Symmetry: C3
Subunit: 511 residues, 3 copies
Amino acid sequence: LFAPPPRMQGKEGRPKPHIGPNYESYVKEWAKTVGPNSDEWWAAKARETLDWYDDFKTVRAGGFEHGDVQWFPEGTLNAAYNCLDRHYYKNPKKTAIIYEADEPSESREVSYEELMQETCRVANVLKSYGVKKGDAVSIYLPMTWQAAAAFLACARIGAIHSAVFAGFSAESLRDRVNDCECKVLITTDEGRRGGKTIATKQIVDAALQQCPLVENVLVLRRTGNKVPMTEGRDKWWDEECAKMPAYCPCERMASEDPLFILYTSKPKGVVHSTAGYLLGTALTLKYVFDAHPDDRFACMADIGWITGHSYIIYGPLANGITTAVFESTPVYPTPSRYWDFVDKWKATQLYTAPTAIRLLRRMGEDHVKNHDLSSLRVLGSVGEPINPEAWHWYNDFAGKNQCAIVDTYWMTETGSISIAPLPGAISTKPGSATFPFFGMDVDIIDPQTGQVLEGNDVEGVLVARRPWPSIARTVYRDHKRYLETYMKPYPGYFFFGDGAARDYDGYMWIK
Amino acid sequence: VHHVHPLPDSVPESEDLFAPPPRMQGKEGRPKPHIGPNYESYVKEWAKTVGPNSDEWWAAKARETLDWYDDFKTVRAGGFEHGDVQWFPEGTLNAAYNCLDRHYYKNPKKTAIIYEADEPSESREVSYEELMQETCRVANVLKSYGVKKGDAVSIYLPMTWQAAAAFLACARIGAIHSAVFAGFSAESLRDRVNDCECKVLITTDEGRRGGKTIATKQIVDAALQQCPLVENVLVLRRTGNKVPMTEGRDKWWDEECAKMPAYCPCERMASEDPLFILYTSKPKGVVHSTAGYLLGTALTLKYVFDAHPDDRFACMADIGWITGHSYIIYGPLANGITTAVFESTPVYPTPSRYWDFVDKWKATQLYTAPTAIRLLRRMGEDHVKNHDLSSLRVLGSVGEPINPEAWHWYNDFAGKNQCAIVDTYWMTETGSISIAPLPGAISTKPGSATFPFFGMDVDIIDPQTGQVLEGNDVEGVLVARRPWPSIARTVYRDHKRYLETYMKPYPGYFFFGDGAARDYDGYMWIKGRVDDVINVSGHRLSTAEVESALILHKGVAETAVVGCADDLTGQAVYAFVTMKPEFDLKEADLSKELAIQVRKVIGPFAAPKKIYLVSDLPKTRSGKIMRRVLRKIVAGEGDQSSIADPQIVEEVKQKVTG
Amino acid sequence: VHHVHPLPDSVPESEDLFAPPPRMQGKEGRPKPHIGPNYESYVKEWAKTVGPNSDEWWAAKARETLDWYDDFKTVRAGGFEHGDVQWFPEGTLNAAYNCLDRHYYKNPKKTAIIYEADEPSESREVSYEELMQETCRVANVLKSYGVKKGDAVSIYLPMTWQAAAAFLACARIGAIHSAVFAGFSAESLRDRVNDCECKVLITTDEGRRGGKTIATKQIVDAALQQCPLVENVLVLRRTGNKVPMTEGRDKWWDEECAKMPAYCPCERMASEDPLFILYTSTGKPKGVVHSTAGYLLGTALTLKYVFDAHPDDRFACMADIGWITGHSYIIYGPLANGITTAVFESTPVYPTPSRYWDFVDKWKATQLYTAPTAIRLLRRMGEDHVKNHDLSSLRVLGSVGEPINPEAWHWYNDFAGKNQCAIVDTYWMTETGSISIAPLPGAISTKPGSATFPFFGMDVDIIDPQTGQVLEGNDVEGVLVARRPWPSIARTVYRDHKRYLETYMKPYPGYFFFGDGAARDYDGYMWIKGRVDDVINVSGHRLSTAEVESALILHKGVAETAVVGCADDLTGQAVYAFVTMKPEFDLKATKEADLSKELAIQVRKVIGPFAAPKKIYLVSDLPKTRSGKIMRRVLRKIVAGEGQIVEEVKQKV
Ligand SMILES: CCCCOP(=O)(O)OC[C@H]1O[C@@H](n2cnc3c(N)ncnc32)[C@H](O)[C@@H]1O
Ligand SMILES: CCCCOP(=O)(O)OC[C@H]1O[C@@H](n2cnc3c(N)ncnc32)[C@H](O)[C@@H]1O
Ligand SMILES: CCCCOP(=O)(O)OC[C@H]1O[C@@H](n2cnc3c(N)ncnc32)[C@H](O)[C@@H]1O
């Protein structure tokens, strides 16, 4: 066990946590977010967290059975306005993105103003190509800060972006491009990671040879090395944006308009809508990571995955804080890079996968023991169970046993963290996600019985009892596959696909 | 000394007045009427809805009745002269939101549609949840075809419940639906599909009505060979019989919808955005806009039929005509009540069908047409006399004048003398009911529409004089003084025809095209189309008044009178007469009895010069008597395909020319 | 004593200050000024509109002046450096609603347009009802061609009242209109049509201007042979004479409109959606883009305050909708205010040079707005055309387009105004959207040739082009800059934002650069001296075109002049003058040599000895654009040797 450490109780001049100090304080608030009286909390949270063009009237409707989940349906908003414009109007020079380049010397801070201006220019480029509200746009970009401008330009005009991880092959890119039927692709000339050159345009050129709908390719000049360019079809990002004004109006989006598709391994195009997803990411960032206005949030994932979607771009920028976009690897130049980064920028949270937490602990304690790491308050794990040898090391060499460790469990289809400790309220057990997040009423069902095994010291499949705002709404042009995979196996429930157990202490353990 | 006479009736005028019966007085546990309990309560509310200070009532009614995304500022503007009528123009709303979403959110399992299939066993209740989900899937299918706000979508569907989902899916996204009655020939379909220039058509494999199979998909294919703009066809699998499916163009409804999410956002529509095009009988595309039309249907449904939240409204018309647009789909669903989609005919499997339907579902109101009333009246009382039917409180009649004889049969046997009868006058171009009794307030006369609805200020003009005839006991052509919210806004891409037809004949007025009389008590009588008058020796006759006289004779089921030129009287009346099957047939003596009764009740100038006793009248598939055919046959123009049974035409030619 | 001099004038400076006359004082039954009665009343209101606390006033004026569908939250944002200017960004509205619907709802029979046809008898009044219905019909026609929000639509229409309907039909549905002056060549039309990539073009069969025919449809057909994207052409039947019509592509306005309803909904536009592109004529055609709310607010406010417009005024701007002046002060400005605006189809000299004054007395115009070129044309025609007219309905007379010489200014004040009108010399540009510097007629005492003081929201300064630094205080001369964005500034150059930044934002970083020379005199009055590019540096003495031309016109029988610089080895540059004499002048009686001597002598007395021209050319007319601006770049290169009025000038040179 490990109760909330000094940095998560207001001591040493730190911000006091939003939920604290004990489990009773967490349960008091979470109880407001589930059950038949939880609309009130969700309605206020919706109106306090997001800027709306038109208010909503209904909080929620629909359910798992037919896949017609609705949240704040009559409201209209825009994700770019909430992640850029509204913070730009309040503090234009605040840093939105810490761009940590592959080479450390090339890093620099990108203000909300600069990010909004680039987003507006790209939005104007997409409009000049004929991209309309509801069209899909594919994005094949590595971890340069302009990836955020690419996402938010699509959201700004109501286009649906579909991000394709920049390590995917020509065939995997082709499949995802063809499935979403985008007519525009946004990519780079080359990607730079761990000191090597990704030939992204070369992969794009070979992929597009079997992509008959793509008519326009916008190419970011990331390296300037000679890459092939197809006349008419291919245009340079900087040359196109130079022609455009640095402001663009926001399309007024219905709450349930699709915000993006994310193909997850045939590739299944997981579709998230606008307000519910945006709310879930902003509330999870705030409470699960205890974000405060001046925080510098360092999520080391990739924007090609949902972790990059929710916890690099949408979550942090919606909260108006600073977010890191890390271009390199955990061990380039040396295995100390994560900590070189943490002290150089004074990151207040770090968020990473157990895979990397174990490629660092394997590289030796010499790379972490002589750093400050004092700016960190919360350390986060995501993607896979953290072995108890990894949990203790991340607490020791990364937190100096003074940061809370949040084991966050979720999936692409949940949009936002489902079960995790709130670091100022929950005492952690290594390898446990502990209690479920606001809006997540989870239970355990016996697969041999189809019956929920109530109580403690139980084990079975993990399910959810009621829809939550950030839940994925469909699988793109394959709603049947959406109902069969998540909704058919346990009627009245959502089926995560993961086994789980709840021990005597009520703590959840994800198998 | 009254110059205006009621439609011929066998009941004395002094005993032919019908006050709201106990079921419409808040007795017997029935809901109390919204407007009651006498005429002055009608006038009291009506007076707030016309004239220089009616904006306040209409602004308030609009905001109470409909859920708006954005409020309106202006209540009304525009006018007849240039056809620029506007209502609530700055407001935005969506018709599918008002007909589905807002009721789904309140009571998702409440029944939206009683789907009464052709085969009675296959009937079932469709919840607001289920109808909304199917509406959103179809809307999502339409968007995947590139249907945008303001695009036309043709609909060629019979009376299954999915037809409501087709209408509402178009409105959900701001597309303009153009519904085509599923009984129309390939040529009529083609003409409508081309005129509206839609790129998408929604239809069935087949339809089932009265136990026969309608080969809609086959008809579609013949039409589409002459509709170059149609790219997508969405085919509902209603029967499952093998039908042709053109690769690429044609997709199955259930297969497309299975790919799509069960919710879809609503397009935020301006008040004056076109909601639909409805062709009449070149085909004239009557355009209605959104807020004023929807408000019109919701208010008339509520007040003309005294609808209350648990009512099960049984309008037996077809969504292919305005009666089904306004009083099956939009009016009843906007009010959040339960509405019937009746897939069958009134006499299938037997003429007991309406009454089986009423008691099975405890229908609270019934709304049908005089041809159906006369059709069941013909088949006798065995099929109706032994039902309860006490769930009914209001019985409606629409489409033509209802002969008093038929009115009394409706009142005696459908209503067991315990329902109010609402004779509702209106047209496709008026959007909603223009003149009718409010059934908790108005004392009814058989054959009279009585008094104008909220927002309708109607007068009678002497057509020779062009001036309004002030007062009572007057006769002329019906006109409306000011625009009302649900009036048609244009004729599709033919605004000149719209102004020339309704707005030019009497400037400052809307011209209905009907002759009308207001009697001594102020009751309005719709007598017929202006174009259909018979002039005999200077006496102008409506067909309805002579036909009402003929049906007072025992054994008569239905008649159609026509005028024919005459050298000494200008025209003469000719009558085609239909008898109940039970009547014992001699023919020459019955015909003389019929002519004598017309001369006694109207005058010798109305007496048919000749009477043709036929076994059936020529009727279209939609049920109307084919009067032009009868006229042209009497006129010697026998050699000059809407006919439901063409063998009848030869039978009529034989009896006239043989 | 003063380093900055007024433009040379025959009147002594101490009698040359003109307080608001009684028509502008609320006497004789005239409306009381919105701002008055003196300089301090102007300053008191103007201080609310600039500086770090001016949001409150702009938010109030925006909500009071325009009808909004959605309110805004942010008043202003962005700046010159990147060209991301935003005003009222979250608000939504529609320009057609604001110029038509809301006035139609209140008083439908009020006259929106006084249509003054080429022939005076063919003129008539167009109600707000009639104009709204024609706008809605055309908007419905455009929607039937598939025009969507954000599409561009070219307009090649002469000055008939339907030009306003075509602009507003585009605004009504959110299309971006691109108007092209109806006299432009086919090659000029082609370039503008292709640049904006429109698929629809609105035009006439023919235009009528001064009894001459404008083969608009013939010119169009030539242009469209090289315009591949244009699919639909809507042809107004202005004359009904036989013009070619291409089957399918071309349709008749009246036949299309007759099929359409006479109401059409308004598209809900964001504040910063583009309203129109307007191409200007030193390089390629520059497509200046204005957005919706700020531009409309600016034209509405300037119309109200610079011309002191009141609800029943009959505003007579004599420009052409092909230029920004007609955009701002014929259509959008006056119709947003709900008043009556004039659409004048003729020329100032058709039928007689009394047309303007015939027009003014026929309609009882309350304000007149025209250009110095027209003023100096009527001047040379003689005063009998104006002398025996009433003209008393007038309260404000305005001048736009170029520096107005004091000689022209007094002729305007004495004859057009009978010394009872305020003269408002209005300085601005296509790129400013609306009037930038002008007298407020109920408050400001005018000097002949001074624009006087900045408008609400305009915070201007003078920079020394030789140092890049602002000149502090009064009695200074340099180049005019603005310190902050204003609501109606142009947002970009269409698909060429880099040219927008390089031209306006980069010359003096931190400021907006107008490209004009200017001086702020000892009283704080601003004087616009000419274009920076037209300045002539004679041995260090920087001479502006306006002051030398204003000197030359003080000579008897001089009608109009242009001076340009060319390099001379001794003085670096020397002044070269092209002079136009009134047509009655006897060129044989006066040897041109003695004319030159008296002219060069007259220049030395008002400006200085360095300012005399090195050579004077007598010409019959000067090279001018279709707008009327003198094409001094042509004269400068022709004088520099580098080669129909141009062939006459080159031969004479
Ligand atoms: C988490 C988003 C990254 C990619 O998301 P994805 O590719 O959709 O995969 C989701 C799967 O990650 C596993 N997982 C996630 N967090 C935990 C945790 N804290 N403890 C144990 N397992 C975890 C689950 O098995 C889940 O199903
Ligand atoms: C009304 C909806 C279906 C028909 O709509 P439509 O096809 O546009 O027919 C309009 C014409 O039907 C006649 N009509 C209609 N209802 C009545 C009535 N209650 N009493 C007398 N005549 C009536 C009129 O002549 C009218 O003008
Ligand atoms: C203003 C609309 C018509 C021309 O619009 P434009 O074609 O954008 O011309 C812009 C240039 O016109 C000159 N100019 C304009 N008005 C004045 C004035 N009152 N005094 C002195 N000069 C003036 C300037 O040099 C300006 O830069």
